[PDB]
Amino acid sequence: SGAIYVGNYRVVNRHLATHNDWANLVWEDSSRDLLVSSTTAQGCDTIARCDCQTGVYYCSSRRKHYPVSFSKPSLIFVEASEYYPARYQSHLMLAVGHSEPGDCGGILRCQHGVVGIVSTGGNGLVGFADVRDLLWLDE
Ligand SMILES: NC(=O)[C@H]1CCC(=O)N(Cc2noc3ccccc23)C1
Ligand SMILES: [Zn+2]
């Protein structure tokens, strides 16, 4: 679990969005596993606008932050789960690191701000859904 709060927006994994997120929907993309909903309160986070390929993410299944080197956002095959059929997930960044399904929503940050959130993983890998291209989050 986990979300990004920026301005009047809440960014979550689409597969973990609540009834309230869908009732206040701004934008969603099943191919990216992202959903953005509107909030009444001003958010605590700021978004990176950079090409960083190193950062630190929070891993709730270890209660720890880990440093990662990650690939540029790209189209990657993701095996079927209870939430989605087997498909290519877009704007996904891979890295070597521990992650379990409940870790989705953990934030990845670089020196510039929030880069993305945990969305995929397994077998010593962790995948992050990028949010740096979503320029409208800042306005
Ligand atoms: N973006 C997706 O399609 C995810 C939907 C929820 C989900 O369980 N997965 C598969 C999964 N197995 O092991 C993981 C470790 C970390 C994060 C996800 C996973 C993929
Ligand atoms: Zn950066």
The domain spans of the chain are: 3-44, 45-139
> Ligand 1 atom closest to Cα of 87?
3
97 Cβ inside 6 Å of ligand 1: no
Exposed (0-12), middle (13-18) or buried (19+): which is 46, by Cβ within 10 Å? Answer: middle
**35/124 Cα distance (integer angstroms):** 26
Resolution reading in Å: 1.6
The DSSP string of 27-45 is EEETTTTEEEEE-SSPPS-
User: How close are the terminal C-alpha atoms of the chain, in Å?
Assistant: 25
Q: Helices (H) and strands (E) in the chain — how many of each?
A: 1, 11
Which positions ≥6 away from 107 have C-beta within 8 Å? 2, 4, 45, 57, 58, 114, 116, 117
Which of 3, 4, 1, 111 minimizes the C-alpha distance to 67? 111
